[PDB]
Amino acid sequence: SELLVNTKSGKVMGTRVPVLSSHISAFLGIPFAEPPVGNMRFRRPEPKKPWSGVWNASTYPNNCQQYVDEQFPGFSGSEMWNPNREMSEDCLYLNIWVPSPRPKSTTVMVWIYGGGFYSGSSTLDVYNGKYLAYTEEVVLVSLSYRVGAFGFLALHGSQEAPGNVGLLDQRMALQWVHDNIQFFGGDPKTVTIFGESAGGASVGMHILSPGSRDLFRRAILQSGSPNCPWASVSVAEGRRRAVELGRNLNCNLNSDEELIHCLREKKPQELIDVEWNVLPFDSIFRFSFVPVIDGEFFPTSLESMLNSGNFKKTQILLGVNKDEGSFFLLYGAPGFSKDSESKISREDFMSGVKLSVPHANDLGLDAVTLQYTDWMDDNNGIKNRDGLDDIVGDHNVICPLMHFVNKYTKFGNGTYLYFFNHRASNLVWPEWMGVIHGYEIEFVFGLPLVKELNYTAEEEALSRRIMHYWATFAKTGNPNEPHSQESKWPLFTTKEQKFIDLNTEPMKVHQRLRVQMCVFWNQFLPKLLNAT
Amino acid sequence: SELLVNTKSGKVMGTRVPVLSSHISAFLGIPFAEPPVGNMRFRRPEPKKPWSGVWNASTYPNNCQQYVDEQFPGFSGSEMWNPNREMSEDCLYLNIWVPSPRPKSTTVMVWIYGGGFYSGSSTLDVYNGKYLAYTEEVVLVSLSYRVGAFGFLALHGSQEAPGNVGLLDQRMALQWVHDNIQFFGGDPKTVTIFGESAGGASVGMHILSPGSRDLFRRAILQSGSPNCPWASVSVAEGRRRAVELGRNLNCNLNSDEELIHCLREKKPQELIDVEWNVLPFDSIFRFSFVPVIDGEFFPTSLESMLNSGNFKKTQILLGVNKDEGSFFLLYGAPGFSKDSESKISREDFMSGVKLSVPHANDLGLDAVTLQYTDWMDDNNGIKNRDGLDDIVGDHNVICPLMHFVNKYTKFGNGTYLYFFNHRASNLVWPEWMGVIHGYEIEFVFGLPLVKELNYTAEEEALSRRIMHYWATFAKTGNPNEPHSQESKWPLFTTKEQKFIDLNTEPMKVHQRLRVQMCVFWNQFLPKLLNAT
Ligand SMILES: O/N=C/c1nc(CCCCCN2CCOCC2)ccc1O
Ligand SMILES: O/N=C/c1nc(CCCCCN2CCOCC2)ccc1O
Ligand SMILES: *[C@@H]1O[C@H](CO)[C@@H](O)[C@H](O)[C@H]1NC(C)=O
Ligand SMILES: *[C@@H]1O[C@H](CO)[C@@H](O)[C@H](O)[C@H]1NC(C)=O
Ligand SMILES: *[C@@H]1O[C@H](CO)[C@@H](O)[C@H](O)[C@H]1NC(C)=O
Ligand SMILES: *[C@@H]1O[C@H](CO)[C@@H](O)[C@H](O)[C@H]1NC(C)=O
């Protein structure tokens, strides 16, 4: 049967799902690890013991335990990102969409969800792999991984809570795809990993980690890169936050053993209730438990790895959105509101700068403020709002990504860079937020092909274009069809630094994406902070 | 007789000079001090002993001893600024142009020449007062003062070489005008002092100095202000340079008495031969012997005087030119040449930055470089050339002046601000130098009214406009004619910060002159340097 697949771990039974007036096979909730529950909380994942019988893979699995966004109850803009399945520590599963009839050996794409390493679900409507698998005839995988303290609590030196175990969750799913996707018609030698935000940083982290490089062919990173200021902490900061967490829960803090045992006795929501209290600064775009620079998953610092070429050399496709910052200002900066234009007073602007660069001294705040203030019109509330927007996105997403892309292209085998700046016509968020963090995903997964979702015909064309860029890149290492008459997406090179816009207008090619601000964020400001 | 005038110091006999197919009276080379020669070198000026008989005031006096520009022999662009009279330490004289017939009690304007406190002459063709005196019916005075070491060698604590004596030369000329201009038909209660560059800084310094405030009514500063980074040094730096000077001349350095006596034995050219060797940095737009913050002429620091309102409160007219920096880059920065377009390589740009901010550390140089580099086009040699031009003018002229004008307007009684950006049609300097430091003077003194000098009719109109703005301001404290139908020059206020362009086009009003760069030069960079 087409819905029955024999794997090295056992048989699985999928389900036939409709898609665009056709059908494909879906294998939902396949386990790839032992449930990381009980005494295994905070530990590295173990591989799933093979099973007898037929595993029912007809339904979506549980989502991992996470903080849940209640800032706008009933509002689809925020709740479409919340878990849409019961939460459970028993959450290490993956999902596969397979073209029908079953392919023999086809291109594989593995989706890694974002969410600041504190949240995320493989089961969201916007991650439904059936449109991409059907349209582009790829085998689409989405994995899952522990977030929050459950995935990233780091007590370096301990083997019970070493840190990075959510990254190892991802790697074990990658190992499982490598070992088993051939049975689903996937080609294990042509696996592209792709992800957005924390998932894009994750993709970059598997590019860097020697233990991960061999498990995939090429990589796509959307609005995230491994060197992002929020994506990792040192071993000392990870230890400090773990101890502060136990301090929030009245834990014996005498030893790692005491602390871990206390934290393992707590119910999941107890950890989530206090998770945000361990941040060291009054900040935005900073998350409590994230990957740790441990000398094991990451052999040395990220910057020295990037400088020495210590990373997998292959092709990469990556990009950013126009207004990456607006989401985080909405949720955490004074003066921003969902239902107003959020014109920003000068006081509020200064408050925003401080939340945005929480590690900066007062001279650093001044440097940032000078760089982003039109002093001919300092009380322009729209310029203050857009200026804060740019600060948050430049510092947290665009300029770290530009630093990564420039270090990587020196040693890599091909780079394609995009600037996604289409505001969707059916967007439920306010105008001022612009082209929001995460809102290219629905185009990458082909949601505008579904008529009931109220996109324009031009947006369907843009989605089909992006889906084909991405799958063609996954298949060949080049998003362009050979001998095609459509406009070509030029390679990004050290010399020319070309990129394209992604929108409903005819493709335009630019160079040196936001280079003025990224020189400030990547060269000048770190020098200023290190000297003062 | 109209050419004979009885003053408190004695009688003087002027000469009738032609001007624009008419005639006026000129009284040239009137002494206002004792010759500061011999044992008086470096000392405060003494007042001139009154004389018997009639002083022959028919000819221009000697110019003070100064370094002479030989960088372009025979080239009128540079030599029109050189002394055009024999040099002598016997040089403390002033010149008066008087309308004919002699007025009874008219507006007086006193010109103070520029030249970095190391050079300058009252006798230059471009300072000929006859056009302004004739056209606007003012009594035009030009004074002189010691420059170089002769005017500004500073051994604080010594009464033989206290410093600032060139400023006291200026003040004694002002005292003489106050005491005697009534006899020439001048009104001593309506004296405007005006000057360019070091002379504009000089004007600002008499505004600040309590010993000078009472000797004039109002003030005009052109491309110079008292707080300029080159216009003054501390008492310790003045002492260091004085000692280094004696070290260059094999002087006994055991005591101030030893040092001063040695320096007084030297011929003037011996001092001039080594004057440039005492600068502490590899710099441009820095001069060896300048005013010193002595606690006497200047009671406290300039910044605290400006903050507390400790200065004469009156009306001021001031402005800058578009390309103040190009002169100094031509003479001292690598890659700039009189006869090429001076397109500037990146290496040369970096060299220029270091010469321009010689007191900056490497982080400060980076801040400057970032502020003035278009990183989308970093190898644009024209952008590097114009960028260096702007750095030099912003840092040395425009932004210090903007700092002065903003501090002053808080306490003053009326400010008028101009941006002079007309390139003269007969300019002999290359195109790349633009609207050069000092090249508004010829318009202020009415040279375009002389047909043989090859200006356009529009330039004659601009000169007449500027002459009338200036004389009307000198007469009333407002450059605008009351109940006039011509376009009005708005007051500069703390709130609106309006200024005008001065060129051959219809007047345009702008606000916040070069405010973006001046926030960098006046707020951020000093903070950066003081913290690092
Ligand atoms: O990948 N997306 C993650 C993402 N994260 C945010 C930050 C929301 C964090 C809210 C934290 N608060 C802190 C105080 O306690 C309650 C929760 C905002 C937009 C985003 O897209
Ligand atoms: O007020 N004008 C003064 C002014 N000053 C300069 C600087 C020229 C200084 C040349 C100094 N050098 C230094 C080395 O020895 C020879 C002389 C350039 C343009 C100007 O307008
Ligand atoms: C698999 O699970 C679904 C939902 O729980 C159920 O409808 C279906 O019959 C199951 N298939 C089996 C048990 O073979
Ligand atoms: C990738 O590597 C191959 C050799 O393995 C080389 O021929 C090709 O030019 C490389 N492409 C890029 C874009 O570096
Ligand atoms: C004044 O000096 C000039 C030039 O030296 C001379 O021509 C003139 O006759 C003199 N007048 C006198 C001495 O009365
Ligand atoms: C100048 O001072 C007078 C009072 O002496 C005042 O009435 C006038 O408004 C002032 N002008 C300005 C521009 O401050």
Tab-separated table of N, CA, C and O in Angstrom, chain B residues 15-82:
chain	number	residue	atom	x	y	z
B	15	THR	N	44.636	111.177	2.317
B	15	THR	CA	44.785	111.353	0.884
B	15	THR	C	43.449	111.094	0.207
B	15	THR	O	42.649	110.284	0.679
B	16	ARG	N	43.166	111.906	-0.783
B	16	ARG	CA	41.978	111.614	-1.655
B	16	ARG	C	42.084	110.448	-2.712
B	16	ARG	O	43.075	110.162	-3.445
B	17	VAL	N	41.299	109.471	-2.564
B	17	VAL	CA	41.465	108.297	-3.410
B	17	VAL	C	40.250	108.158	-4.315
B	17	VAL	O	39.112	108.401	-3.883
B	18	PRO	N	40.449	107.785	-5.574
B	18	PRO	CA	39.307	107.537	-6.451
B	18	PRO	C	38.633	106.224	-6.088
B	18	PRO	O	39.260	105.294	-5.569
B	19	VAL	N	37.331	106.171	-6.346
B	19	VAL	CA	36.543	104.975	-6.093
B	19	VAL	C	35.281	105.072	-6.935
B	19	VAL	O	34.457	105.980	-6.743
B	20	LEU	N	35.147	104.162	-7.902
B	20	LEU	CA	33.938	104.042	-8.709
B	20	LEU	C	33.552	105.387	-9.327
B	20	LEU	O	32.418	105.865	-9.193
B	21	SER	N	34.528	106.021	-9.983
B	21	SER	CA	34.324	107.309	-10.656
B	21	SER	C	33.901	108.417	-9.685
B	21	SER	O	33.243	109.383	-10.080
B	22	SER	N	34.265	108.284	-8.414
B	22	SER	CA	34.089	109.334	-7.414
B	22	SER	C	35.344	109.330	-6.546
B	22	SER	O	36.377	108.764	-6.921
B	23	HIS	N	35.267	109.951	-5.370
B	23	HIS	CA	36.424	110.042	-4.489
B	23	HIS	C	35.967	110.023	-3.037
B	23	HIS	O	34.861	110.466	-2.715
B	24	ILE	N	36.841	109.514	-2.161
B	24	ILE	CA	36.689	109.608	-0.714
B	24	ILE	C	38.065	109.831	-0.098
B	24	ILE	O	39.089	109.832	-0.785
B	25	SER	N	38.082	110.009	1.219
B	25	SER	CA	39.306	110.268	1.963
B	25	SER	C	39.794	108.963	2.563
B	25	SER	O	38.988	108.142	3.011
B	26	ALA	N	41.115	108.785	2.580
B	26	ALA	CA	41.742	107.621	3.186
B	26	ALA	C	42.807	108.100	4.151
B	26	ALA	O	43.602	108.978	3.807
B	27	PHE	N	42.825	107.521	5.347
B	27	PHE	CA	43.847	107.806	6.351
B	27	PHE	C	44.554	106.488	6.638
B	27	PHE	O	44.053	105.667	7.414
B	28	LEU	N	45.711	106.287	6.007
B	28	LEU	CA	46.391	105.001	5.987
B	28	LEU	C	47.602	105.018	6.908
B	28	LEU	O	48.374	105.980	6.923
B	29	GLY	N	47.774	103.933	7.653
B	29	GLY	CA	48.931	103.780	8.509
B	29	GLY	C	48.967	104.702	9.711
B	29	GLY	O	50.033	105.241	10.034
B	30	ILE	N	47.833	104.907	10.377
B	30	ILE	CA	47.848	105.648	11.639
B	30	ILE	C	48.335	104.719	12.745
B	30	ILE	O	47.787	103.613	12.903
B	31	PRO	N	49.335	105.123	13.527
B	31	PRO	CA	49.789	104.283	14.643
B	31	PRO	C	48.805	104.315	15.800
B	31	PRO	O	48.257	105.366	16.147
B	32	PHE	N	48.575	103.150	16.406
B	32	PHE	CA	47.735	103.099	17.598
B	32	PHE	C	48.467	102.526	18.798
B	32	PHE	O	47.878	102.442	19.884
B	33	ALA	N	49.730	102.138	18.638
B	33	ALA	CA	50.516	101.606	19.736
B	33	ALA	C	51.969	101.995	19.522
B	33	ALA	O	52.359	102.426	18.440
B	34	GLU	N	52.772	101.852	20.569
B	34	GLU	CA	54.210	101.932	20.391
B	34	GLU	C	54.702	100.715	19.599
B	34	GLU	O	54.131	99.626	19.707
B	35	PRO	N	55.730	100.876	18.770
B	35	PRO	CA	56.286	99.720	18.049
B	35	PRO	C	56.751	98.645	19.017
B	35	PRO	O	57.574	98.901	19.907
B	36	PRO	N	56.236	97.471	18.896
B	36	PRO	CA	56.526	96.396	19.861
B	36	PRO	C	57.844	95.685	19.559
B	36	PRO	O	57.903	94.468	19.380
B	37	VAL	N	58.920	96.456	19.506
B	37	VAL	CA	60.199	95.975	19.024
B	37	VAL	C	61.155	95.835	20.200
B	37	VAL	O	60.925	96.367	21.293
B	38	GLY	N	62.238	95.097	19.967
B	38	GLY	CA	63.299	94.996	20.965
B	38	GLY	C	62.830	94.288	22.218
B	38	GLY	O	62.192	93.232	22.164
B	39	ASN	N	63.141	94.883	23.372
B	39	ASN	CA	62.672	94.371	24.654
B	39	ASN	C	61.152	94.323	24.766
B	39	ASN	O	60.643	93.716	25.712
B	40	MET	N	60.415	94.939	23.849
B	40	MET	CA	58.967	94.859	23.894
B	40	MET	C	58.401	93.681	23.107
B	40	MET	O	57.196	93.417	23.212
B	41	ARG	N	59.221	92.959	22.337
B	41	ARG	CA	58.717	91.784	21.634
B	41	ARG	C	58.101	90.824	22.638
B	41	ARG	O	58.661	90.584	23.711
B	42	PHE	N	56.922	90.312	22.302
B	42	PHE	CA	56.088	89.409	23.085
B	42	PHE	C	55.309	90.127	24.195
B	42	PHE	O	54.448	89.496	24.812
B	43	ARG	N	55.554	91.416	24.455
B	43	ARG	CA	54.862	92.133	25.526
B	43	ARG	C	53.509	92.679	25.072
B	43	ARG	O	53.253	92.890	23.881
B	44	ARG	N	52.652	92.947	26.054
B	44	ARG	CA	51.419	93.672	25.779
B	44	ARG	C	51.737	94.984	25.061
B	44	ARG	O	52.760	95.615	25.349
B	45	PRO	N	50.898	95.422	24.129
B	45	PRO	CA	51.163	96.696	23.455
B	45	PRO	C	51.103	97.860	24.440
B	45	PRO	O	50.391	97.813	25.443
B	46	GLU	N	51.923	98.940	24.149
B	46	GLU	CA	51.696	100.181	24.870
B	46	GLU	C	51.003	101.186	23.958
B	46	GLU	O	51.179	101.147	22.736
B	47	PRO	N	50.223	102.114	24.505
B	47	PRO	CA	49.588	103.119	23.647
B	47	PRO	C	50.623	104.037	23.021
B	47	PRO	O	51.692	104.283	23.586
B	48	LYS	N	50.306	104.521	21.824
B	48	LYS	CA	51.222	105.378	21.084
B	48	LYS	C	51.372	106.724	21.793
B	48	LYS	O	50.374	107.370	22.119
B	49	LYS	N	52.615	107.148	22.036
B	49	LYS	CA	52.842	108.491	22.558
B	49	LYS	C	52.355	109.510	21.535
B	49	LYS	O	52.705	109.407	20.348
B	50	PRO	N	51.554	110.491	21.940
B	50	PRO	CA	51.118	111.526	20.994
B	50	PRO	C	52.309	112.213	20.341
B	50	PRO	O	53.401	112.287	20.907
B	51	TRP	N	52.089	112.708	19.129
B	51	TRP	CA	53.151	113.283	18.319
B	51	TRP	C	52.852	114.747	18.028
B	51	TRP	O	51.692	115.174	18.016
B	52	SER	N	53.918	115.513	17.804
B	52	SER	CA	53.801	116.865	17.279
B	52	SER	C	53.752	116.825	15.757
B	52	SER	O	54.056	115.813	15.129
B	53	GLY	N	53.377	117.943	15.160
B	53	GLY	CA	53.347	117.968	13.719
B	53	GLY	C	52.190	117.157	13.166
B	53	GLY	O	51.248	116.768	13.866
B	54	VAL	N	52.279	116.905	11.866
B	54	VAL	CA	51.218	116.247	11.116
B	54	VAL	C	51.708	114.876	10.671
B	54	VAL	O	52.724	114.766	9.974
B	55	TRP	N	50.985	113.831	11.069
B	55	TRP	CA	51.351	112.480	10.673
B	55	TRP	C	50.879	112.248	9.242
B	55	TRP	O	49.697	112.436	8.934
B	56	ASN	N	51.812	111.860	8.370
B	56	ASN	CA	51.540	111.593	6.958
B	56	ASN	C	50.822	110.251	6.872
B	56	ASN	O	51.442	109.195	6.998
B	57	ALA	N	49.511	110.287	6.655
B	57	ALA	CA	48.681	109.091	6.571
B	57	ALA	C	48.211	108.848	5.142
B	57	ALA	O	47.049	108.510	4.900
B	58	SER	N	49.112	109.045	4.198
B	58	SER	CA	48.812	108.878	2.792
B	58	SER	C	49.176	107.528	2.213
B	58	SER	O	48.792	107.197	1.133
B	59	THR	N	49.922	106.753	2.961
B	59	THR	CA	50.371	105.470	2.490
B	59	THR	C	50.170	104.309	3.463
B	59	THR	O	50.239	104.476	4.641
B	60	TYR	N	49.964	103.126	2.921
B	60	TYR	CA	49.760	101.913	3.692
B	60	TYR	C	50.955	101.607	4.575
B	60	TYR	O	52.055	101.861	4.210
B	61	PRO	N	50.720	101.059	5.747
B	61	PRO	CA	51.835	100.758	6.651
B	61	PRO	C	52.522	99.432	6.327
B	61	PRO	O	52.072	98.692	5.446
B	62	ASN	N	53.600	99.123	7.049
B	62	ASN	CA	54.194	97.792	7.002
B	62	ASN	C	53.197	96.741	7.482
B	62	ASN	O	52.287	97.032	8.259
B	63	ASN	N	53.378	95.506	7.014
B	63	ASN	CA	52.660	94.356	7.545
B	63	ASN	C	53.483	93.683	8.636
B	63	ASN	O	54.714	93.770	8.654
B	64	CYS	N	52.796	92.983	9.534
B	64	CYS	CA	53.514	92.309	10.600
B	64	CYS	C	54.318	91.123	10.047
B	64	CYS	O	54.039	90.581	8.971
B	65	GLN	N	55.351	90.748	10.798
B	65	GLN	CA	56.216	89.652	10.403
B	65	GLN	C	55.434	88.345	10.429
B	65	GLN	O	54.756	88.037	11.419
B	66	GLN	N	55.523	87.585	9.335
B	66	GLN	CA	54.715	86.383	9.167
B	66	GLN	C	55.368	85.415	8.179
B	66	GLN	O	56.170	85.805	7.318
B	67	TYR	N	55.003	84.139	8.321
B	67	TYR	CA	55.288	83.162	7.281
B	67	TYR	C	54.612	83.593	5.987
B	67	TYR	O	53.480	84.094	5.994
B	68	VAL	N	55.317	83.422	4.874
B	68	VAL	CA	54.840	83.873	3.575
B	68	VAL	C	54.611	82.653	2.693
B	68	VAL	O	55.469	81.764	2.612
B	69	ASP	N	53.445	82.609	2.058
B	69	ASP	CA	53.046	81.491	1.211
B	69	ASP	C	53.813	81.543	-0.104
B	69	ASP	O	53.646	82.479	-0.891
B	70	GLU	N	54.658	80.536	-0.341
B	70	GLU	CA	55.366	80.394	-1.604
B	70	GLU	C	54.974	79.113	-2.327
B	70	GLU	O	55.666	78.696	-3.264
B	71	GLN	N	53.877	78.480	-1.913
B	71	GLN	CA	53.509	77.191	-2.474
B	71	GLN	C	53.226	77.278	-3.980
B	71	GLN	O	53.450	76.302	-4.702
B	72	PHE	N	52.790	78.440	-4.482
B	72	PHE	CA	52.445	78.618	-5.900
B	72	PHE	C	52.976	79.953	-6.411
B	72	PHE	O	52.217	80.914	-6.607
B	73	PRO	N	54.284	80.037	-6.668
B	73	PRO	CA	54.887	81.324	-7.055
B	73	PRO	C	54.250	81.907	-8.312
B	73	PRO	O	54.035	81.213	-9.311
B	74	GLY	N	53.930	83.199	-8.242
B	74	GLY	CA	53.274	83.887	-9.330
B	74	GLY	C	51.783	83.669	-9.421
B	74	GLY	O	51.118	84.364	-10.196
B	75	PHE	N	51.227	82.737	-8.658
B	75	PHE	CA	49.812	82.416	-8.757
B	75	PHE	C	49.019	83.393	-7.897
B	75	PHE	O	49.264	83.509	-6.692
B	76	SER	N	48.070	84.097	-8.514
B	76	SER	CA	47.386	85.169	-7.804
B	76	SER	C	46.466	84.626	-6.721
B	76	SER	O	46.198	85.320	-5.731
B	77	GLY	N	45.984	83.392	-6.886
B	77	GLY	CA	45.085	82.825	-5.895
B	77	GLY	C	45.682	82.821	-4.501
B	77	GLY	O	44.989	83.100	-3.522
B	78	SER	N	46.974	82.500	-4.395
B	78	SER	CA	47.646	82.443	-3.102
B	78	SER	C	48.343	83.753	-2.745
B	78	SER	O	48.338	84.153	-1.570
B	79	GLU	N	48.929	84.444	-3.730
B	79	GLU	CA	49.747	85.611	-3.422
B	79	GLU	C	48.918	86.842	-3.081
B	79	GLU	O	49.414	87.725	-2.373
B	80	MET	N	47.661	86.904	-3.524
B	80	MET	CA	46.780	87.983	-3.089
B	80	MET	C	46.575	87.990	-1.577
B	80	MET	O	46.097	88.993	-1.037
B	81	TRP	N	46.918	86.898	-0.883
B	81	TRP	CA	46.827	86.848	0.568
B	81	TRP	C	48.139	87.176	1.262
B	81	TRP	O	48.128	87.467	2.465
B	82	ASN	N	49.254	87.148	0.535
B	82	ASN	CA	50.561	87.421	1.108
B	82	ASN	C	50.724	88.906	1.425
B	82	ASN	O	50.033	89.753	0.858
